[model samples]
Target: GAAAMAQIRIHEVNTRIENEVKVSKFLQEEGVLYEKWNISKLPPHLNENYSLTDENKAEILAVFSKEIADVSARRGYKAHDVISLSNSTPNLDELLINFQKEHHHTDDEVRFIVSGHGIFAIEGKDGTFFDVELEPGDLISVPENARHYFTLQDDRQVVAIRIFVTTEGWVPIY
Candidate 1:
């Protein structure tokens, strides 16, 4: 509850860059894309199922078709999938560990939050880090080769749609 409503904050990773810039301006300059959507008015069916089926996935893709298309065309991504998390998911620890550490990927990291919240720490080329607080209806696209890490909010729950060139392209370089 508290974590869900917490405000986002961004700070320098190691005082490498001036921290006076606003989050939006910083992210924009770094080539990262962030957007907020209205989730309260979503169709009831979308809220009914946390596990995404092909049909539901299609609906989500259609809803953000323009954005998805832009990403796909610009980044060469061709596939997408859903990652649903809760207190009960198996090997949740392992998953968290993988994302919690600073790492970079060969392909762009794109996510559309369906429910819950998380914090993304993104490192810019100048060694500054952006601590991005994301919630339901937030969509973000981290450029390929960008160093970043992710952690769930205090609630330890999140459901998101991930887009990629290929699922295998998600390999991280620590």
Candidate 2:
């Protein structure tokens, strides 16, 4: 397979923010938290099993339990869960339609990509939208009230751990 960086793209000028440092700086200014975690400890069976069962999801969560707890302690997230989406998913199309819409949340939209890929088209304060693409090990938290939309990458599959800081469930507001 060829190589691809988790680069940022500007739709306005159609240029890319290719440098990792520059990407970090750009997203930092917009108040988006982008970080990378080490996924090497994840076993092959669990890492590649996109269609994971409940027990499997629990195992994956167990592997990342410390990391999850640490972030929760630091960020005040109350709960966490594992999710996977692929062509095999029964309602992939329906969910994609919902996810593609531009919206913001009362609480942060946080995700850590355990496998596969995803993209966040985040709107900055300058009123321009840019893409924050995610690969395995990528962690992103779209800050509260930041306008953004999500779309699958060309791969069209992803497995991620979602953490939340809310008493209510995930809420999206247009």
Candidate 3:
């Protein structure tokens, strides 16, 4: 729960890759972007609370207004929103299984972890596998057309700030 840097876990391996620079370099080798954000600015109520209301979402946006705009301007991400997935979310396991089928997207997959944790499963050439365990303050941008899937960590919950070029092309290209 106190993990601030993204943990790179290779499937079926007991070792961990927790170095910030190493994580970024490793993902960079695969043409992905990995970075961290300053999350201490967020107020206490919105810190890691999963039961976010509409107003809470708005406040999240407000709190990270500059950061969002900064990334948006730098990366050309035009649409942004807050998303949450938890045990309380209806049919979560069903949706998770669907995600496990694995697929790519037309647009880049970008996420800023605001709370909780999730694992991004990245499939590599030769069937090699590595997953990035994201926690609060982490940012990851899986390149467009990159094959990947997502699932929650042991915490079984996550709240993230999503950045997109456009929402229309978010459909999975299986």
Candidate 4:
């Protein structure tokens, strides 16, 4: 594989603001509550936007690899070598499920949206799907036990930043 280029930039929102800006603004206006359990021990950097630099890609892949390994080992999954896609349109109905009925992932399904948007419908938590419209510099951390599915609106190109905790090769149970 050729050396690709990538970069990630983060925008900090001031939670004290009252005006409507964007996702970043909203986060600042509403404020984020941080908990010890919600913190990631190994948070890897990812690229934001369409620039897929080699460094960015490597960092993103490393994050995924680490997560995949951890998840597989914890759940007793007999395989490794995590596989995921990047800023591309995925079949919402196929890859994204509505519930845990057919979906299976031992650990957290972490996704960083370097660009674009997506929606996830988590069962029990709420009947309505949580529409996650991400932009450059956004990370969506899904819980391991959460039964949810995702949908990329209108087949729009979504640059995804994913982290897997597995290193060994395993078959995906679709």
Using lDDT as the measure, the top candidate is 3
Error of 2 at 128 (Å): 0.4
lDDT by residue (tens digit), candidate 3, 4-90: 788888887656788878878888887778877888988998877999899999999898888888888987899888999988999
* lDDT of each residue in 1-174, candidate 1, tens digit only: 433322345573333222324555667888887766566656778873566777887786677677667767866779877778877888999878999999989878889887778778888677767677776777788888888999898888887879888877799899
| lDDT scores in order | 0.74, 0.84, 0.85, 0.40
Model 2 Cα lDDT, one tens digit per residue, 65-123: 88888778877788889999999999889988887999888898889988888889989
| Ranking of predictions according to TM-score | 2, 3, 1, 4
What is residue 139's positional error in candidate 2, in angstroms?
Answer: 0.6
Candidate 2 residue pairs in backbone clash: none
Task: Give candidate 3's error at residue 35 in angstroms.
Answer: 1.5
Candidate 4 ranges with C-alpha deviation above 4 Å:
1-56, 59-102, 126-129, 167-174
For candidate 4, lDDT tens digit of each residue in 50-144?
44566665655465555445544654444322123343535634544443233545565555454445544443243323333344344444555
Error of 1 at 47 (Å): 3.0
Worst 10 residues of 1 by lDDT: 12-21
